Design an enzyme around this catalytic site. Structure first.
Site, PDB file in Angstrom:
ATOM      1  N   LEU A  14     -22.821  -1.354   9.943  1.00 26.83           N
ATOM      2  CA  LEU A  14     -22.636  -0.592  11.195  1.00 26.83           C
ATOM      3  C   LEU A  14     -23.580   0.600  11.288  1.00 26.83           C
ATOM      4  CD1 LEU A  14     -18.738  -0.672  11.466  1.00 26.83           C
ATOM      5  CD2 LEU A  14     -20.348  -1.987  12.857  1.00 26.83           C
ATOM      6  N   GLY A  15     -23.670   1.364  10.204  1.00 20.38           N
ATOM      7  CA  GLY A  15     -24.679   2.416  10.074  1.00 20.38           C
ATOM      8  C   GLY A  15     -24.610   3.153   8.754  1.00 20.38           C
ATOM      9  N   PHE A  19     -24.557  11.021   3.427  1.00 21.82           N
ATOM     10  CA  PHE A  19     -24.281  10.532   2.065  1.00 21.82           C
ATOM     11  C   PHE A  19     -23.930   9.039   2.028  1.00 21.82           C
ATOM     12  CE2 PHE A  19     -22.577  15.072   2.010  1.00 21.82           C
ATOM     13  CZ  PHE A  19     -23.747  15.618   1.481  1.00 21.82           C
ATOM     14  N   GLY A  20     -23.023   8.618   2.913  1.00 25.65           N
ATOM     15  CA  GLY A  20     -22.411   7.283   2.867  1.00 25.65           C
ATOM     16  C   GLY A  20     -23.075   6.170   3.664  1.00 25.65           C
ATOM     17  N   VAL A  22     -21.547   2.910   6.289  1.00 29.68           N
ATOM     18  CA  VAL A  22     -20.385   2.382   7.033  1.00 29.68           C
ATOM     19  C   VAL A  22     -20.583   0.886   7.336  1.00 29.68           C
ATOM     20  CG1 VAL A  22     -18.845   2.698   9.030  1.00 29.68           C
ATOM     21  CG2 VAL A  22     -20.073   4.663   8.100  1.00 29.68           C
ATOM     22  N   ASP A 135     -21.927  19.416  11.752  1.00 28.97           N
ATOM     23  CA  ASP A 135     -22.774  18.242  12.067  1.00 28.97           C
ATOM     24  C   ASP A 135     -22.390  17.577  13.410  1.00 28.97           C
ATOM     25  OD1 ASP A 135     -24.800  16.282  11.753  1.00 28.97           O
ATOM     26  OD2 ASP A 135     -24.051  15.569   9.827  1.00 28.97           O
TER      27      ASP A 135
HETATM   28  O1  OV0 Z   1     -16.077   1.856  13.953  1.00 32.00           O
HETATM   29  C1  OV0 Z   1     -16.322   2.857  13.286  1.00 32.00           C
HETATM   30  N1  OV0 Z   1     -15.441   3.683  12.593  1.00 32.00           N
HETATM   31  C2  OV0 Z   1     -16.134   4.598  12.027  1.00 32.00           C
HETATM   32  C3  OV0 Z   1     -17.563   4.508  12.292  1.00 32.00           C
HETATM   33  N2  OV0 Z   1     -18.564   5.324  11.924  1.00 32.00           N
HETATM   34  C4  OV0 Z   1     -19.783   5.006  12.432  1.00 32.00           C
HETATM   35  C5  OV0 Z   1     -20.884   5.912  12.057  1.00 32.00           C
HETATM   36  C6  OV0 Z   1     -20.793   7.312  12.262  1.00 32.00           C
HETATM   37  F1  OV0 Z   1     -19.678   7.860  12.803  1.00 32.00           F
HETATM   38  C7  OV0 Z   1     -21.864   8.157  11.916  1.00 32.00           C
HETATM   39  C8  OV0 Z   1     -23.039   7.622  11.361  1.00 32.00           C
HETATM   40  C9  OV0 Z   1     -23.141   6.236  11.153  1.00 32.00           C
HETATM   41  C10 OV0 Z   1     -22.072   5.387  11.495  1.00 32.00           C
HETATM   42  F2  OV0 Z   1     -22.191   4.057  11.267  1.00 32.00           F
HETATM   43  C11 OV0 Z   1     -20.005   3.882  13.281  1.00 32.00           C
HETATM   44  C12 OV0 Z   1     -18.936   3.006  13.612  1.00 32.00           C
HETATM   45  N3  OV0 Z   1     -19.010   1.851  14.418  1.00 32.00           N
HETATM   46  C13 OV0 Z   1     -20.073   1.138  15.000  1.00 32.00           C
HETATM   47  C14 OV0 Z   1     -21.444   1.335  14.715  1.00 32.00           C
HETATM   48  C15 OV0 Z   1     -22.433   0.612  15.406  1.00 32.00           C
HETATM   49  C16 OV0 Z   1     -22.078  -0.350  16.373  1.00 32.00           C
HETATM   50  C17 OV0 Z   1     -23.158  -1.024  17.168  1.00 32.00           C
HETATM   51  O2  OV0 Z   1     -23.995  -0.323  17.739  1.00 32.00           O
HETATM   52  N4  OV0 Z   1     -23.189  -2.375  17.205  1.00 32.00           N
HETATM   53  C18 OV0 Z   1     -22.347  -3.297  16.441  1.00 32.00           C
HETATM   54  C19 OV0 Z   1     -23.049  -4.653  16.516  1.00 32.00           C
HETATM   55  C20 OV0 Z   1     -23.851  -4.589  17.807  1.00 32.00           C
HETATM   56  C21 OV0 Z   1     -24.212  -3.112  17.946  1.00 32.00           C
HETATM   57  C22 OV0 Z   1     -20.711  -0.594  16.623  1.00 32.00           C
HETATM   58  C23 OV0 Z   1     -19.725   0.136  15.932  1.00 32.00           C
HETATM   59  C24 OV0 Z   1     -17.688   3.402  13.091  1.00 32.00           C
END
Ligand code: OV0
Length: 290
Positions: A14-15, A19-20, A22, A135
């Site tokens: 997802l991203g 530090f982490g 996801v 942040d």
């Molecule tokens: O659901 C979540 N719960 C927590 C959380 N954190 C982050 C997060 C953040 F907060 C800060 C930095 C980096 C991160 F990844 C992202 C995230 N969800 C999603 C990230 C990207 C897509 C998307 O663009 N897509 C999916 C496939 C097609 C395109 C969808 C969802 C979640």
């Protein structure tokens, strides 16, 4: 409820935060691909200090129950190493940065002020428990649906001391310097008022529609000079902000909202508005429009 590691099936990346990392995972204990889809944060490197910092983030997020903050679901422990995984709700529309960049002006001003109001309310709640986010940016705001956003990443979040109203970080890592207040750049002081400064930069981000040439990194670098590099970017940004150099009025941004941005971008720390005032004022503007 506890989350067993063996049953946590990977689906996609997802991203990545500071530090982490996801991931999108299915918690499928029945083993028929019917189980719950969740967001899973894990550490990239698992440093001496970072594992303790990630434990602190988990306890911060676990203690926050609000409509505009992402929901803690659980944790997943593993082995003698004690490697932690933070289980959160999956929000399928992704970050507000990407969402708004994809749709652009098709998201009208009424929708932006709804997201603005929700971010304020999330931040005001965060302030009552004495947490400084450090942040606040559109890449860390997440979209649940078309009418609802939530504050996502609490990796750099600090608890205030009992006797003080700022946190002074001594050895800072990677820093979002183009979202930072002058006192955070000069003295490394972080407070509720420095989060309000960052909220002003989010309000700029929203009303620019995440245009690449109009971003805070692009615009601040234009003002100081694209020739500036490394620690000299911080030096020249400090002097620029000290002499009332600010981000410009975005294209088609209304008057009332540009006034909020500039009040948040005050060099005097105490003259900046509270998140309680900002939520009231933005709601009053929405009532006047609609
Ligand atoms: O659901 C979540 N719960 C927590 C959380 N954190 C982050 C997060 C953040 F907060 C800060 C930095 C980096 C991160 F990844 C992202 C995230 N969800 C999603 C990230 C990207 C897509 C998307 O663009 N897509 C999916 C496939 C097609 C395109 C969808 C969802 C979640």
């Amino acid at each position: 409820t506890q989350f067993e590691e063996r049953h946590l099936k990977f689906l996609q990346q997802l991203g990545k935060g500071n530090f982490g990392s996801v991931e999108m995972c299915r918690y499928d204990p029945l083993q028929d691909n019917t189980g719950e889809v969740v967001a899973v944060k894990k550490l990239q490197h698992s440093t001496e200090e970072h594992l303790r910092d990630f434990e602190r983030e988990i306890e911060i997020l676990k203690s926050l129950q609000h409509d505009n903050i992402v929901k803690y679901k659980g944790v997943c422990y593993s082995a003698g190493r004690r490697n932690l995984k933070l289980i959160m709700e999956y929000l399928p529309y992704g970050s507000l940065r990407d969402y708004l960049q994809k749709h652009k002006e098709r998201i009208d001003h009424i929708k932006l002020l709804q997201y603005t109001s929700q971010i304020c309310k999330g931040m005001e709640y965060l302030g009552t428990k004495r947490y400084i986010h450090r942040d606040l940016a559109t890449r860390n705001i997440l979209v649940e649906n078309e009418n609802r956003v939530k504050i996502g990443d609490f990796g750099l979040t600090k608890v205030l001391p009992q006797d003080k109203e700022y946190y002074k970080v001594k050895e800072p890592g990677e820093s979002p310097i183009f979202w930072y207040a002058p006192e955070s750049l000069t003295e490394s002081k972080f407070s509720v008022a420095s989060d309000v400064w960052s909220f002003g930069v989010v309000l700029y981000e929203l009303f620019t529609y995440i245009e690449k040439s109009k971003s805070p990194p692009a615009e601040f670098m234009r003002m100081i000079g694209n020739d500036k590099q490394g620690q000299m970017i911080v030096f020249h940004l400090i002097e620029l902000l000290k002499n009332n150099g600010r981000l410009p009025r975005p294209d088609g941004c209304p008057d009332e909202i540009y006034m909020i941005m500039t009040e948040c971008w005050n060099n005097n720390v105490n003259q900046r508005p509270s998140f309680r005032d900002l939520a009231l004022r933005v709601d009053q503007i929405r009532d006047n429009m609609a």
